[PDB]
Amino acid sequence: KNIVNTSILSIVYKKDDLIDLSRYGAKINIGDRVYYDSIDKNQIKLINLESSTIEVILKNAIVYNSMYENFSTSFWIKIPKYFSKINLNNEYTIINCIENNSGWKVSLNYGEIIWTLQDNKQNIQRVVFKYSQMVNISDYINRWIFVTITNNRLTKSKIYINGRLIDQKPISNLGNIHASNKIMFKLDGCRDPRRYIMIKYFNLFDKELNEKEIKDLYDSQSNSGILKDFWGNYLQYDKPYYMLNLFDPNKYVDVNNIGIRGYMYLKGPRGSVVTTNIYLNSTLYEGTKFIIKKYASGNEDNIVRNNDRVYINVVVKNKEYRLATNASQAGVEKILSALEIPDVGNLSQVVVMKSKNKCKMNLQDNNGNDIGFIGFHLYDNIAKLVASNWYNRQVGKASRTFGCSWEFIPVDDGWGESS
């Protein structure tokens, strides 16, 4: 019943190959320089080499002249930060269904995801998503984005980003769009040899998806049982993460002293990384690193899941300490401390990991009672990290709750700031 089942092409990883999950069984030819993420094999990396290619041949049986009258494409994409002036004014095709100068393609440029419909009279229409590299904290740079492009020959071509309309151009003026049976995924025309993309869950639909169908597609493909890091990859155990509190993203976490008389606090503003005319962003690699440690998970995999019960380690001067509190302290607000792992004793330290990318951490006492979601509280102009059941009540008493949602930011090559 999810609209994704109606896909006429659904590229997924199985065994050691990409296959069409649709019942229409397209053929998929993979070049020698196509890579899969060791953790999430559906994450495909295409690099800037002629052998980094995925060729889809649709069955001629499903390819008909008027199929591109109503159609949508959906996929997820991770586009590394553009670092060089070579990247400016260099539109490069990534997904090509063009034959006899008619069809559709997806291209990228500096801060752009571009859709092109060409008819058989060579009239073109472009819809364009623009994202700035001149922002403190980008929702788009080097992060998994869900793209949905819908097309109705009587109305418009529309581009959606994470389920939200961004551009729309009327296409009623265009002629007939040639239906190729070939789709080529490959970097085409990119003058920067170090460029790559990552792509997952490519779908083609023989329909103009509506807003409500795009939202179900986005929500269904999110995998909300697995937590995500800032980039949108799987959250992992034993991996160091810089912390961001979504209520105040211009701050980072620091530790004031080790032990139960010490505390953790939000501090800012963030620094800045710059290449004039290319990017200006807040530094992400700032503050105390958190490491998620297995408590209730076995050594099956290192993936952190919804409702996993974990420990949190905190790195101070390349040494690990345990996030803990005394649940007995006066007041709802329990100030967190970084404790010597030997000393934690019976101090509350078990955290329930939850999805709302948007991670929550529910601290529990040693009887499995809630101490509360990890957030912060102002004590005389210091925003100290706390566990507070204030947050747990507010979730049930308000449409929204602010301050107990976090992002976990590991070092990533597509971001390229010094670690």
Numbering used by the authors: 871 to 1226, 1233 to 1295
The study reports:
Botulinum neurotoxins (BoNT) are a group of clostridial toxins that cause the potentially fatal neuroparalytic disease botulism.
Clear positive difference map electron density was observed at the GBS of molecule B that could be readily modelled as GD1a, whereas for molecule A, the GBS is inaccessible to GD1a due to crystal packing. Therefore, the HC/A2:GD1a asymmetric unit contains both the GD1a-bound and unbound states of HC/A2. GD1a forms a total of 10 hydrogen bonding interactions to HC/A2, two of which are water-mediated. However, the loop spanning residues 1269–1277 appears to widen upon GD1a binding—the distance between the Cα atoms of residues 1269 and 1277 is ~4.5 Å greater in molecule B than that in molecule A. This change in loop positioning is accompanied by the rotation of Phe 1278 towards the GBS, a feature that has been observed previously in the HC/A3:GD1a, HC/A4:GD1a, and HC/A5:GM1b structures. Using DynDom (which estimates domain motions in proteins), the HCN/A2 subdomain appears to rotate 3.6° in one direction when bound to GD1a, but 6.7° in the other direction when bound to SV2C.
